[PDB]
Design a protein around this ligand. Structure first.
Ligand SMILES: [Ca+2]
Ligand SMILES: [Ca+2]
Ligand SMILES: [Cl-]
Lengths: 316, 317
């Protein structure tokens, strides 16, 4: 039983991940921390609370995080990807369960300090709360067991624009703080997650399954699948956040390369993630020199990942 | 009937190999060499271009000296640890007798392209300063140049100066961004392509033992170049950068290309980074890749065909 905190912006695929995580027996969800991205932070908290109620676990703490990136300013949210409500325009009634008093940053510091080296963090949105925890407690990185990050585009196109992936673009300063923190980090970029999909056929199979949340998941995914058809020209959905959850439980379904990762924080390439694989000896020092390397997902065993995700989504 | 070509270059060991190859190509008419800094300071590149014209038995070919610094200014640091102090593997050859023309490389580019509209191709082997200067000074330049084939960038691959950037683009990021958005017929060959094309120690020995017109000189330059590849890349031989972009001018059928808008990062840790928008994804809103005219980016290379063509020109008697 691995202790896990999910830092998230639910979010359609975040919602699928959270419901999958509640059904996983080898995982103990000790809390959900929320962030902006797919929806404003208040909307993410509302969804996280609704998901806890839906999974039959309203006692699981939900800690609201930052309303804006580290640099400040009202974030632009992906309402064209996840709907006005962040869950595909289902416009569900409000939760009865309430968030905890403490911020997501304080919740992360407290839980990780309570069980040092035992709590893993699965980061499914912009990395603001994680960076805030790193800055407020400089021992946070060393106490966290592992940080599995869904974010970045390594030697591949971004999904916000050609340079940047959404989570990194949401807070490039926070991502750069996290990637250079010295913590045990595993980054799963969209160069990996775009290889893992659910087709229209797979979604119909989910709708017709005996899955506990099959009907709700299918309904939510309609809006998400429609964005994929309009933007990527793909008839189905990419499984971004469910793949990073698979990397927590089954890292053996992937291969990783170690390297220093830096994030561009200004100019036309704001939010671009770049890894130094260390295969070339540089003549002089550069921005990738001297930092501790992190693990970057390089390859994925697509059938094994799909099988694992499908069995959790279709579990009665 | 020969294709008019201007070579903008920083010789430079692989630049020197390309220029000698170009002088032996019968379908090509070299109408001039335009020099830039990079592998060596501009003055060193001019000295080498003049010596190469003399070596090829063509001292009448004009050499026009270009910019001594990038568009943003400052004395550039040069790759002397790659090409030697003289830019040609520390051969320290006597000075050329031939002299450079009076006009700058930028004015030479404008003049020749305006003299022969739609006929002159430009092969850019160094930082793009002179080409950007011609584009800025003459707004009709982009429409009158036949084609600009660029050796530069690293597309969805690591740079060679640092993880973000390839040397030619890093040498002048502002100039590269001006060129890539100029609207001219541009073909870019990045190191993602050229690092797939190599000459082994065995290939180099084969050149030394060949009946090649410049075999002895080429082998001598390549000794220093090979030592850098062994120290930095861990490779026993050399990558063929500039000769591959020359192969793209004469045999574009040895490659596949993808069309897309290319932008260059000019600031921060990713200064000199080249990024192309393939246009396979419909964006919700406008971004820095929106509205520009797409250019051709080399995507794949037929490595045996490119090697065979390069070897043929290097070993030609
Ligand atoms: Ca997410
Ligand atoms: Ca060159
Ligand atoms: Cl931003």
């Amino acid at each position: 039983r691995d202790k896990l905190i999910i830092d998230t912006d639910p979010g359609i695929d975040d919602s699928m991940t959270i419901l999958m995580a509640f059904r996983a027996p080898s995982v103990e969800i000790i809390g959900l921390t929320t962030i902006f991205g797919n929806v404003d932070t208040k909307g993410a908290t509302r969804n996280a609370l609704l998901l806890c109620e839906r999974a039959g676990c309203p006692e699981v703490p939900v800690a609201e995080g930052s309303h804006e990136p580290l640099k400040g300013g009202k974030p632009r949210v992906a309402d064209f990807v996840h709907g006005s409500d962040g869950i595909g325009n289902l416009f569900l009634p409000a939760p009865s369960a309430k968030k905890v008093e403490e911020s997501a940053a304080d919740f992360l510091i407290n839980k990780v300090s309570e069980f040092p080296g035992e709590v893993s963090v699965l980061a499914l949105g912009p990395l603001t709360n994680v960076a805030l925890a790193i800055k407020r407690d400089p021992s946070f990185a060393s106490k966290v067991k592992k940080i599995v990050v869904l974010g970045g585009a390594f030697f591949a196109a971004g999904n916000v624009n050609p340079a940047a992936e959404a989570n990194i673009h949401g807070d490039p300063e926070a991502a750069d703080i996290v990637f250079t923190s010295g913590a045990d980090i595993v980054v799963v970029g969209i160069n990996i997650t775009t290889q893992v999909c659910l087709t229209d056929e797979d979604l119909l199979e989910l709708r017709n399954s005996k899955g506990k949340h099959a009907a709700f998941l299918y309904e939510m995914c309609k809006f998400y699948r429609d964005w994929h058809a309009k933007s990527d020209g793909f008839h189905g959905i990419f499984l971004h956040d469910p793949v990073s959850f698979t990397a927590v439980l089954h890292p053996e379904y992937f291969t990783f390369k170690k390297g220093v990762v830096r994030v561009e924080t200004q100019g036309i390439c704001t939010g671009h993630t770049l890894m130094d694989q260390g295969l070339k000896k540089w003549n002089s020092e550069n921005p990738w020199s001297g930092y501790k390397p992190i693990s970057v997902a390089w390859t994925v065993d697509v059938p094994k990942v799909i099988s694992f995700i499908k069995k959790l989504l279709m579990a009665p």
